[PDB]
Design a protein around this ligand. Structure first.
Ligand SMILES: CCCCCCCC/C=C\CCCCCCCC(=O)OC[C@H](COP(=O)(O)OCC[N+](C)(C)C)OC(=O)CCCCCCC/C=C\CCCCCCCC
Ligand SMILES: CCCCCCCC/C=C\CCCCCCCC(=O)OC[C@H](COP(=O)(O)OCC[N+](C)(C)C)OC(=O)CCCCCCC/C=C\CCCCCCCC
Ligand SMILES: CCCCCCCC/C=C\CCCCCCCC(=O)OC[C@H](COP(=O)(O)OCC[N+](C)(C)C)OC(=O)CCCCCCC/C=C\CCCCCCCC
Ligand SMILES: CCCCCCCC/C=C\CCCCCCCC(=O)OC[C@H](COP(=O)(O)OCC[N+](C)(C)C)OC(=O)CCCCCCC/C=C\CCCCCCCC
Ligand SMILES: CC(C)CCC[C@@H](C)[C@H]1CC[C@H]2[C@@H]3CC=C4C[C@@H](OC(=O)CCC(=O)O)CC[C@]4(C)[C@H]3CC[C@]12C
Ligand SMILES: CCCCCCCCCCCCCCCCCCOC[C@@H](O)COP(=O)(O)OCC[N+](C)(C)C
Ligand SMILES: CCCCCCCCCCCCCCCCCCOC[C@@H](O)COP(=O)(O)OCC[N+](C)(C)C
Ligand SMILES: CCCCCCCCCCCCCCCCCCOC[C@@H](O)COP(=O)(O)OCC[N+](C)(C)C
Ligand SMILES: CCCCCCCCCCCCCCCCCCOC[C@@H](O)COP(=O)(O)OCC[N+](C)(C)C
Ligand SMILES: Nc1[nH]ncc1-c1cc(Cl)ccc1Oc1cc(F)c(S(=O)(=O)Nc2cscn2)cc1Cl
Ligand SMILES: *[C@@H]1O[C@H](CO)[C@@H](O[C@@H]2O[C@H](CO)[C@@H](O)[C@H](O)[C@H]2NC(C)=O)[C@H](O)[C@H]1NC(C)=O
Ligand SMILES: *[C@@H]1O[C@H](CO)[C@@H](O)[C@H](O)[C@H]1NC(C)=O
Ligand SMILES: *[C@@H]1O[C@H](CO)[C@@H](O)[C@H](O)[C@H]1NC(C)=O
Ligand code: NA
Lengths: 119, 173, 1273
């Protein structure tokens, strides 16, 4: 699967960050079977943290490190699974991954975004 | 494949008779489990009484004096998907004259769907001393003979007319 | 003359400019011989050595005034340039332009460009090129830029006359260069790569003789303008008819009656996505992707008990098959016209609407499928004739010596050549004995025989090589071919499976004495010879289409695969790689495009796939037709001129025949000599009155009526005859009466004509045989011999009693006379194609014998993988484990030569061929489980077989049939051979109709208002306005669709009412203006009838739709709206001429249709007699079978076009368990068994398709004759 994500995303501290992630899939996105995972790792060899998953509807795990600042900002039917980080803090710096599975597509999509927070 | 043919309505005393009951399912490729029940109402009587029930390759005959030891199965064999429900009478008596009902209970198996349907066929049987010849055969045979006779006399008359005319023409020359 | 050669110098340019200035102060075609791109005339002789490839003065006087200069190459090629400086810098005398010109005209330049283009074409076939390829792409781009720069510098860019940009073919080069650079600098990858296919079109401008072929192909199209307009009009009219009749019918589905949880149809339909969930509410046949269709009439498809028919859901075939909108209806009508899988649409429409609507398909086939195709072939035929006529018209305007001589004497023409021919025949007969269940002794015998034949042929080669000199030996092409065959056989002996079949080509050595095999040799030789450029163009076009398809849709097939396959694997036909993409294009050329186009539209969208498939169909079919026509006409008229005698050198076979005529006759005469040395007016009057009786018209009418009644009585003997006891008895007694009548008729003819006259007549012989069969059947029944097997089988011969009608109707008599006269010419070509097909059959037995066996799971009918059960023994072990396991072979295969013939017949007709190809390409070995596309490149076998035994074989057949019918016409004075005398009189009368001189001008009424209306209606603008009103009405009918709101229906109906009112007003105005002269024109009569039926039909349709409930009657009555749009042919002159030619063709078509209907009737009676109880699998089902006369006619009309005859043949090939059940009990009948007879069924279907082919060829030829007469008179 082709996953369109920005490799490096620089967002000002205190502002809102949109993390774009779109996929080009042949088949229509079936909400009863579409899968979406948004993980977070401090480094490439670090642990991934599950914070927003789509199994049937938008499930936000409400991680303590993000408070309630993580929002869904896409449309699965329109091949957009972007997520929104309100009031980005310096600790939000890290690696964000969007995993996409859209059956009956065999392949699994994976996009990686390196979020950098400047003063 | 399967043709619904009506039963003969006349049986002769002392010989054998087959009562025809054919119930073809609407599509031949479907799979069904069928069992049948027969009821008989004799002449001068009003109530239909059950005489037999065929299910699972075995025939159950009711305790009836007019049919005990006199009826055998003549329908489909080797299947639960019966399309022929005919019965066979070995010794026709005057007590077999009357009306018969052939109840067909067919259970069709579809994809996540079971349909229980039913069909009823009515047969009227008259027991007679001798086999009355059909009107159609007699009429057709008589018509064939009269047609052949008419054609041959027409041809003969035409030949004699033409022969006389040509003989007169030859005599003229 | 030849002395006219001088270098172009500055003085010459100054003189030319001075002449131009003089012309300006004062203020013709050039030599086609001296025209650019042509050989310099021989009148100029050789060129001085220092003069070639140099700027020279203009030779042509026409350009001698203007500023030009000519450069001649070493091949004496004339190239014209412009003396004006190139981009105002480079002059002809400048060294830079001199070098550019020197490079431009050379052999190594064109050859280098050819090699570069071919290499780029080879690289274009890669779907996933490696990363080392980009350097090669840059090299290809640089090479093209080199030639572009050379041409621009030498010729100038745009300003001049003979400059780079004036030539249309350099625009392609410029587009290629700019696209390559622009797309490289800017950086859809598929879109960019599809533009690289334009480099493959530079092939036309580099190889000589290709531009002229392309120009001729473009010229052939321009003559097709009127035929295309008529085709579009007819397809639109039939699409409107189909839209009106079958709208929404393909949406009928069997919906279950009982629903739980308070569910209702609307509540179900919006919560269903998968076919698994659809299968729980609708009825599906096992292994089907679409729901079973149903209808509401008694003659439509039936739902199972528990389901009810309802119009809901999507249409079949992914929804692409429907009559819901005008566009889908137009696609369906195009599919019917091209007869691509049309039997499927026919079956679906009959299932959903009823068997009565077969009338629509018969009319559509006859008009669009047969007649519209006829005009396309006819017009292209004339286009090449006029091109051919113009082409020729303008063209005409010591001990070693001793024993070599001994061996040379040993090679005797009467004996050695005849012995070699006999050995060749015995050899090809020997290899036809190979078959799969063959014992080791038989294989040993075949091997030793093959070795012996090879040794003898090698000995012949060696003897001929040592007898006459090897240098003299390789002078004859036949000797070279024999040497190649011998060395191939020796190479095989030292060692493939295919190489063992290369010794089959020695059969072509009989073409020296066999004249119609030499015709095939010349036909094949011409395609690669005189016609090599056209075949090359066809190959280039096929390659371009294949690569374009692969680039456009190849990745779409892989990514979107799960939409067209449940296993999410590539289907059998796809464009992911070059080979399969080429296979798709070849299959489209064969005539099958709809089924792959469905998958293409599913994976890549409708618009792109539709455009690509339509372009492929049009261009490819046009080029194939052009190649076929050129081959036909060349090998027919240009090759055969009787230049030499019949075997001018006395043929060795003929010399041996003369020796035999000497020897056998002399020996027989000597044996005879040795034997002789050792030793009553009344009877004449009876004959005369019988003659006077039989010859009368009343007798003929009576016998004809008897024949019709006796033939029609056969149609009643179906599987339902036991429900009609009275009719059964009536028919038995009527059969007795008919037998009596025909016996009496036979006796009367015997008395009238005598035994000699009666038995010299063939029709009387046919009647005699039929009546004897009937009498034997009658006598056997009476004496108790009614159930004997031979007697019961002889009863089925009553289906030949309709043959008595052949002599009674004159049209069938003349058509049968034409066919019988044609038979002798057909037989020689039949033998030729039988030998040609025997070669391919032996090769197929070599390749595929015994390898189509597979282990399948019977319940689902799927082949097991090869990881488990890879062997026959493993399959039998699996049967020992699992019950529903079978090691099954295909019914039609290459196990022996006869089965190979059946397979080749299926492949040549493209009916059932795909299963054979899949089995062949999955082949591994004998007793080995097949693997998916293990032998992938055995598709080449089928492609070669199609090309040779389907294209060239049909080419030869048509070529000989043309000459045969031409000779038939000549001997009888040129009269039509398919027409009777009275038909000829009516034909001449209708000929006078289409040639009338302009009638008297219509008198103008003296009244003022009447006169003004007369001037108004007489004007041409009135007719043009009526035509545009008819076009607007056509568009309004096109707007109508499925599921439209009632408001839209009312608006469309009111617009139609307005149109009807306008047309009625036009009719009233014409009636007022022309008075009684209005009815003196046939077209005005047609218009008057049209307006009357329009008004009456609109009011009747309103009454039916509001006060009655009869949708069928409403749709049938609404057909009167078609009459309004049929008036468009009034203004179109060309399509009017084409329709005149059609109506001219009608009588002969009527006679041939009568013969075809009689043959269909006979085959239908035989079908109900034989195949009424076969298993309902493959093409035989509950609606399309042989149970009744109507069903048999439905089946036989379908296979008259050969569509789906394999599916009907398949169930009849079942003869043994577990394929069939010989003890099958059928309720309501005493017939036992559902098994078919393979021999009878094969004979049935093969004979029927052959007879249909012959009759249809007659219809083609008749229509062609009428069209050719019309267009050139
Ligand atoms: C050398 C040159 C050779 C000729 C080249 C030009 C020839 C043809 C060009 C065809 C262009 C077609 C463009 C289509 C664009 C498009 O997107 O069209 C959409 C419509 C309506 O689609 P829908 O909304 O009903 O889809 C519902 C889908 N479902 C049913 C699966 C649920 O498509 C439709 O009606 C399909 C209409 C198809 C009509 C027949 C096409 C022409 C055939 C033969 C011409 C003569 C040869
Ligand atoms: C280019 C023009 C094309 C025109 C159309 C051509 C269509 C194709 C023609 C025919 C198709 C069917 C051919 C036969 C198919 C296979 C039949 C089959 O499976 O047969 C098997 C049997 C072998 O039995 P067995 O030895 O195992 O028995 C037991 C022996 N024990 C006891 C010693 C063990 O063989 C038999 O019976 C064979 C008997 C029949 C042999 C027919 C051979 C082919 C004949 C003609 C072909 C040319 C066309 C003629 C018409 C032109 C018009
Ligand atoms: C599907 C549902 C709908 C089915 C409809 C079926 C019927 C429709 C059409 C069939 C009939 C077509 C008839 C064509 C006739 C053409 C013709 O040959 O017409 C001859 C005469 C011309 O008479 P004239 O104008 O020269 O006057 C003569 C005045 N005198 C007598 C003083 C000299 O036709 C006349 O008389 C007038 C003939 C009028 C015919 C009936 C018109 C409607 C009422
Ligand atoms: C589904 C469709 C449902 C609706 C169908 C509506 C149409 C069907 C039937 C209406 C038929 C109306 C009458 C047709 C014949 C009219 C007539 O009176 O035609 C006469 C012509 C012969 O005279 P002419 O045309 O040479 O004119 C001579 C005078 N001059 C040269 C100055 C022009 O007959 C001929 O040619 C014969 C022409 C035969 C045309 C058959 C068309 C069948 C459709
Ligand atoms: C007019 C020309 C083109 C054809 C002339 C006929 C012969 C050259 C060929 C054509 C069909 C051939 C026959 C096709 C099939 C068979 C059956 C084959 O035996 C089997 O298939 C046995 C199968 C088994 O035992 O299970 C033996 C050869 C034979 C008679 C072939 C012998 C050679 C034949 C007669
Ligand atoms: C030559 C042209 C092609 C052949 C044409 C032959 C004549 C035309 C032969 O047409 C036969 C069809 O009409 C049969 O379909 P029906 O719907 O009429 O069948 C009704 C059956 N039941 C419901 C009454 C039992
Ligand atoms: C059996 O019927 C035979 C009749 O139909 C024969 O009729 P004809 O052909 O005799 O009819 C009269 C013919 N002639 C006698 C005038 C020649
Ligand atoms: C010119 C040549 C003409 C040859 C004509 C030959 C006879 C042509 C006879 O054609 C009509 C019959 O075929 C009709 O047969 P059916 O059995 O379909 O009709 C009755 C159906 N039911 C009512 C019993 C179900
Ligand atoms: C493919 C099937 C095509 C069927 C076409 C049917 C057309 C049916 C109509 O045929 C065309 C008519 O104009 C002439 O028909 P005839 O050839 O019968 O005219 C001469 C009549 N006499 C002089 C012998 C009495
Ligand atoms: N029913 C309706 N709604 N709105 C207007 C009307 C209407 C009004 C009137 Cl005054 C008369 C009939 C009417 O109904 C039709 C009008 C048509 F024009 C056609 S037609 O387009 O098929 N033409 C045609 C020629 S012959 C058979 N049909 C079909 C119909 Cl039912
Ligand atoms: C046909 O297929 C089987 C596939 O298993 C071949 O392999 C043999 O299979 C059996 C049972 O699994 C093993 O016990 C044998 O050891 C296998 N053979 C060998 C040599 O390893 C089998 O050999 C094949 N038989 C034929 C006739 O080709
Ligand atoms: C019907 O019964 C008779 C008498 O037992 C028997 O001979 C015959 O085979 C039977 N036929 C069928 C159809 O079972
Ligand atoms: C109708 O549907 C409702 C659910 O919406 C259900 O509760 C009720 O029992 C149903 N009644 C019938 C008549 O089936
Ligand atoms: Na197809």
């Amino acid at each position: 699967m082709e996953v369109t994500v920005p490799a490096t995303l620089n967002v000002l501290n205190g502002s809102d960050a949109r993390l774009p992630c779109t996929f080009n899939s042949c088949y229509t996105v079936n909400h009863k079977q579409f899968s979406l995972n948004w993980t977070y790792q401090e480094c490439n060899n670090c642990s991934e943290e599950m914070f927003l998953q789509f199994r049937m509807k938008i499930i936000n795990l409400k991680l303590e490190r993000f408070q309630d600042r993580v929002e869904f900002s896409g449309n699965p039917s329109k091949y957009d699974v972007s997520v929104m980080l309100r009031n980005v803090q310096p600790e939000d710096e890290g690696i964000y991954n969007c995993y996409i599975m859209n059956p009956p597509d065999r392949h699994r999509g994976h996009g990686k975004i390196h979020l950098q927070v400047l003063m | 494949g399967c043709v619904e043919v009506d039963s003969e309505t006349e049986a002769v005393y002392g010989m054998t008779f087959k009562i025809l009951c054919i119930s073809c399912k609407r599509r031949s490729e479907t799979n069904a489990e069928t069992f049948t029940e027969w009821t008989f109402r004799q002449k001068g009587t009003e109530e239909f009484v059950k005489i037999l029930r065929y299910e699972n390759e075995v025939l159950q005959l009711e305790e009836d004096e007019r049919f005990e030891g006199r009826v055998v199965w003549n329908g489909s064999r080797g299947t639960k998907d019966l399309q022929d429900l005919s019965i066979f009478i070995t010794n026709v008596t005057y007590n077999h004259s009357g009306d018969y009902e052939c109840h067909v209970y067919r259970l069709l198996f579809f994809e996540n769907y079971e349909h229980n349907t039913s069909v009823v066929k009515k047969i009227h049987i008259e027991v007679v001393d001798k086999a009355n010849r059909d009107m159609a055969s007699i009429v057709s045979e008589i018509m064939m003979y009269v047609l052949i006779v008419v054609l041959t006399i027409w041809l003969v008359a035409e030949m004699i007319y033409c022969y006389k005319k040509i003989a007169a023409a030859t005599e003229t020359a | 003359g030849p002395q006219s050669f001088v270098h172009f110098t500055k003085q010459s340019l100054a003189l030319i400019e001075q002449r131009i200035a003089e012309r300006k102060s004062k203020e013709p075609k050039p030599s086609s011989d001296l025209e650019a791109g042509k050989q310099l005339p021989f009148i100029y002789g050789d060129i001085p050595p220092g003069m070639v490839s140099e700027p020279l003065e203009d030779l042509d006087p026409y350009y001698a005034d203007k500023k030009t200069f000519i450069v001649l190459n070493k091949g004496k090629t004339i190239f014209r340039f412009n003396a004006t400086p190139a981009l105002y810098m480079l002059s002809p005398f400048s060294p830079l332009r001199r070098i550019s010109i020197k490079i431009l005209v050379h052999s190594l330049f064109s050859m280098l460009i050819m090699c570069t283009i071919l290499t780029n074409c080879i690289f274009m076939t890669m779907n996933n090129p490696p990363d080392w390829t980009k350097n090669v792409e840059y090299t290809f781009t640089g090479i093209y830029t080199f030639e572009s720069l050379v041409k621009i510098l030498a010729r100038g860019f745009c300003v001049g006359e003979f400059t780079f940009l004036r030539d249309p073919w350099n625009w392609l080069d410029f587009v290629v260069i700019v696209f390559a650079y622009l797309t490289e600098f800017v950086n859809n990858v598929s879109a960019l790569r599809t533009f690289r296919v334009l480099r493959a079109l530079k092939t036309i401008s580099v190889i000589p003789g290709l531009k002229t072929i392309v120009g001729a192909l473009i010229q052939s199209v321009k003559k097709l303008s009127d035929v295309m307009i008529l085709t579009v009009f007819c397809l639109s009219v039939f699409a409107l008819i189909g839209l009106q009749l079958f709208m929404g019918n393909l949406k009928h589905k069997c919906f279950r009656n009982s629903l739980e949880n308070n569910e209702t149809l609307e509540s179900i339909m919006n919560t269903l996505e998968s076919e698994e969930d659809f299968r729980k509410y609708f009825y599906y046949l096992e292994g089907s992707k679409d729901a079973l269709l149903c209808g509401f009439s008694t003659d439509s498809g039936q739902c199972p008990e528990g389901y009810t028919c309802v119009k809901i859901g999507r249409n079949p075939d992914y929804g692409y098959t429907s009559f819901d909108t005008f566009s889908w209806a137009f696609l369906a009508l195009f599919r019917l016209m091209t007869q691509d899988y049309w039997e499927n649409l026919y079956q679906q429409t009959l299932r959903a609407a009823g068997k009565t609507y077969m009338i629509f398909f018969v009319v559509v086939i006859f008009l669009g499928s047969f007649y519209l195709i006829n005009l396309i072939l006819a017009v292209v035929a004339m286009a090449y004739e006029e091109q051919n006529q113009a082409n020729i018209e303008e063209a005409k305007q010591p001990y070693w010596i001793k024993f070599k001589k001994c061996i040379y004497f040993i090679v005797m023409d009467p004996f050695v050549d005849l012995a070699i021919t006999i050995c060749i025949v015995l050899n090809t007969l020997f290899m036809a004995m190979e078959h799969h269940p063959m014992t080791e002794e038989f294989k040993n015998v075949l091997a030793i025989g093959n070795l012996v034949f090879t040794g003898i042929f090698a000995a012949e080669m060696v003897l001929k090589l040592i007898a006459m000199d090897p240098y003299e030996y390789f002078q004859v092409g036949w000797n070279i071919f024999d040497s190649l065959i011998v060395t191939l056989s020796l190479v095989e002996l030292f060692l493939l499976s295919v190489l063992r079949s290369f010794r089959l080509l020695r059969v072509f050595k009989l073409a020296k004495s066999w004249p119609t095999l030499n015709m095939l040799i010349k036909i094949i030789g011409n395609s690669v010879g005189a016609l090599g450029n056209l075949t090359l163009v066809l190959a280039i076009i096929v390659f371009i289409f294949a690569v374009v398809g692969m680039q456009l849709f190849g990745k779409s097939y892989k990514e979107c695969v799960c939409k067209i396959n449940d296993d999410c694997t590539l289907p059998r036909w796809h464009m992911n790689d070059f080979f399969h993409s080429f296979l798709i294009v070849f299959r489209v050329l064969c005539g099958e495009w709809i089924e792959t186009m469905w998958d293409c539209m599913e994976v890549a969208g409708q618009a792109m796939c539709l455009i690509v498939y339509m372009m492929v169909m049009v261009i490819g079919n046009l080029v194939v037709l052009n190649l076929f026509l050129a081959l036909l006409l060349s090998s027919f008229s240009s090759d055969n001129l009787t230049a030499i005698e019949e075997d001018p050198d006395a043929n060795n076979l003929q010399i041996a025949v003369t020796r035999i005529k000497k020897g056998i006759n002399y020996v027989k005469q000597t044996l005879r000599e040795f034997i002789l040395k050792a030793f009553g007016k009344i009877w004449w009057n009876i004959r005369k009155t019988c003659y006077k009786i039989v010859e009368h018209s009343w007798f003929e009418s009576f016998i004809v009526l008897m024949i019709l009644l006796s033939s029609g009585a056969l149609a009643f003997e179906d599987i339902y005859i036991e429900r009609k006891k009275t009719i059964k008895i009536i028919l038995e007694y009527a059969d007795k009466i008919f037998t009596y009548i025909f016996i009496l008729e036979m006796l009367l003819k015997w008395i009238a004509y005598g035994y000699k006259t009666y038995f010299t007549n063939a029709w009387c012989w046919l009647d005699f045989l039929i009546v004897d069969v009937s009498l034997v059947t009658l006598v056997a029944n009476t004496l108790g011999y009614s159930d004997l097997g031979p007697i019961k089988s002889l009863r089925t011969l009553r289906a030949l009693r309709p043959l008595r009608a052949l002599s009674r109707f004159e049209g069938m008599r003349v058509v049968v006379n034409a066919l019988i006269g044609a038979i002798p010419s057909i037989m020689n070509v039949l033998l030729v194609c039988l030998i040609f097909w025997l070669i391919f059959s032996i090769m197929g037995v070599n390749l595929f014998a015994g390898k189509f066996y597979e282990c399948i799971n019977t319940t689902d009918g799927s082949r097991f993988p090869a990881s488990q059960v890879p062997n026959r023994s493993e399959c039998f072990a699996l049967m020992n484990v699992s019950q529903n396991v079978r090691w099954k072979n295909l019914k039609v295969n290459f196990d022996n030569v006869g089965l190979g013939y059946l397979s080749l017949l299926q492949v040549a007709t493209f009916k059932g061929w795909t299963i054979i190809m899949y089995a062949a390409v999955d082949s591994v070995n004998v007793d080995k489980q097949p693997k998916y596309e293990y032998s992938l490149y055995m598709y080449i076998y089928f492609v070669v077989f199609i090309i040779f035994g389907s294209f060239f074989t049909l080419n030869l057949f048509i070529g000989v049939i043309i000459d045969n019918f031409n000779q038939q016409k000549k001997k009888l004075g040129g009269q039509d051979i398919f027409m009777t005398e009275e038909q000829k009189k009516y034909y001449n009368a209708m000929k006078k109709l289409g040639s009338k001189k302009p009638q008297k001008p219509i008198p103008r009424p003296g009244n003022k208002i009447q006169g003004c209306i007369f001037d108004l209606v007489t004007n041409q603008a009135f007719d043009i306005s009526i035509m545009v009103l008819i076009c607007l009405n056509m568009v309004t009918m096109m707007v109508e669709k499925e599921g439209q709101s009632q408001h839209m229906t009312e608006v469309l109906y009111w617009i139609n009412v307005v149109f009807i009112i306008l047309f009625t007003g036009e009719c009233v105005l014409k009636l007022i203006s022309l008075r009684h002269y209005y009815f003196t024109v046939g077209w005005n009569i047609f218009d008057f009838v049209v307006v009357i039926i329009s008004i009456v039909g609109m009011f009747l349709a309103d009454l039916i739709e509001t006060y009655f409930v009869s949708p069928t009657l409403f749709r049938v009555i609404r057909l009167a709206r078609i009459g309004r749009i049929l008036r468009l042919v009034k203004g179109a002159k060309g399509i009017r001429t084409l329709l005149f030619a059609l109506m001219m063709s009608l009588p002969a078509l009527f006679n041939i249709g009568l013969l075809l209907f009689l043959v269909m009737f006979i085959y239908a009676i035989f079908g109900m007699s034989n195949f009424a109880y076969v298993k309902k699998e493959d093409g035989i089902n509950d609606m399309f079978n042989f149970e009744t006369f109507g069903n048999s006619m439905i089946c036989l009309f379908q296979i008259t076009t050969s569509a789906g005859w394999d599916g009907l043949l398949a169930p009849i090939l079942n003869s043994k368990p577990p394929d069939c059940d010989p003890k099958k009990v059928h309720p309501g009948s005493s017939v036992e068994g559902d098994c078919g007879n393979p021999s009878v069924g094969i004979f049935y279907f093969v004979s029927y398709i052959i007879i249909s082919f012959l009759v249809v060829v007659n219809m083609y030829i008749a229509v062609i004759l009428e069209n050719f007469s019309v267009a050139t008179e």
